[PDB]
């Protein structure tokens, strides 16, 4: 019933601008502040600023003050966060949140968040390479050179869930991501069982199935 | 204006333990401090507001205290759903967050199972070679991985990732990837991964020889 729906995941070129929207619903719009908080991968929560949708008054963190503009549209009960001069360090999930201020001060309700990725890389499906097995055996799938995030890996559709580790992706110097998914299996199975990684890169409409053989 | 310092950065605990987390303000911020729980892949959840007030629907095991410059968030007995990152937030002027204190699950030491993967033949077709080193199911998190090519220490040319604590055994796993051109890769014979971990008596080395 309370809702703060945020714009969908976005990719923007460095130096460009982004305008994230926050559509509020299920409570009276003018009665709560809207906060914007972000989280870059590997960093802690970062508060950007507030806006009073009643007047349009803003309060920014000094750190975002010259690049970040927050606006609202009361007719559509929607709040906006615009950020200009985007740099890779601006790659984060951006949240909007509903907050009472003054007699009591808290942020009580949160949006789902929006990923903004800042890069010049073009969308690209992954190359999938086998990590061949060499009492238990490990094998896997090296999922190389894709953009953007995310990728999903499952094993055997997925009959195999046990002992699986799909690693967080790394940003390579190329600007493409890369990860490994590994599983442990019985060494006795390598003669009988065929092991397939099912890699799904939704952002590029790419599905790859790579058989991993000893 | 006013800085917030959270302590510790990392903490390990068992179910039913009492955990205490600290936030120190560089100047007096009085009442205006909130505490949040944040798990990966979700928005923060408000636990404590105004330093000492319990947010509705929050279990009693959570409590905050302090005023001025020193704040405490304690969890009386830690329950298994409580393992998350915790943030303090100033709710005055700029609503600055603290750095976060990560509360992870305590367990007995476990040595990593170590594995090395040579590049696949189809990747070599692309003119790139990636050697992957797997460190499986180890505790605690702190570990050290070293790549050695022809017994020469490698530095700054590999990437690594660590999993979060496993949901069943609470261990970590780490993957490290050394990536070279096919040209460079074919210029060397011996690729090695050396790992030191407190669960190991002496450092473990996995390795292979390109032509073999």
Author numbering:
A (entry chain H): 1 to 134, 141 to 220
B (entry chain L): 1 to 212
What does the paper say about this structure?
We previously isolated human anti-VP6 antibodies and expressed these as Fabs in a bacterial expression system. In the current study, we sought to test the activity of these antibodies as dimeric IgA molecules in a model of immunity at mucosal epithelia. Therefore, the data suggest a mechanism of inhibition of the transcriptional pore is steric hindrance of the pore, rather than induced conformational change.
When identified on a space-filling model of the atomic resolution structure of the VP6 trimer, it became apparent that two separate regions (which we designated region A [amino acids 231–260] or B [amino acids 265–292]) on each VP6 protomer were recognized by the Fab. When we examined the arrangement of the epitope regions A and B from each protomer in the configuration of VP6 trimers on the DLPs, it was clear that the Fab could only bind to regions A and B when they formed a continuous epitope at the junction of two protomers; an Fab could not bind to region A and B on a single protomer. The interaction confirmed the quaternary nature of the epitope, with the antibody interacting with both region A and region B of adjacent VP6 protomers within a single VP6 trimer. The residues on the antibody surface that interacted with VP6 (paratope) also were determined by DXMS. Residues 52–59, corresponding to the hypervariable complementarity-determining region 2 of the heavy chain (HCDR2) was shown to be strongly protected from exchange upon complex formation. The light chain residues 25–42 and 85–94 also were shown to be protected strongly upon complex formation. Poisson-Boltzmann analysis of the Fab electrostatic surface show that both paratope regions in the heavy and light chains resided in positively-charged regions of the Fab surface (paratope shown in Figure S2 in File S1). The light chain inserted deeper into the transcription pore, while the heavy chain bound to a region higher up in the pore. There are five epitopes at the Type I channel, but modeling indicates that steric hindrance between Fab fragments limits the number of Fab fragments bound per channel to a maximum of one. The size of the Fab in the Type I channel likely is sufficient to sterically block RNA egress from the channel even if the charge determinants are not essential to replication.
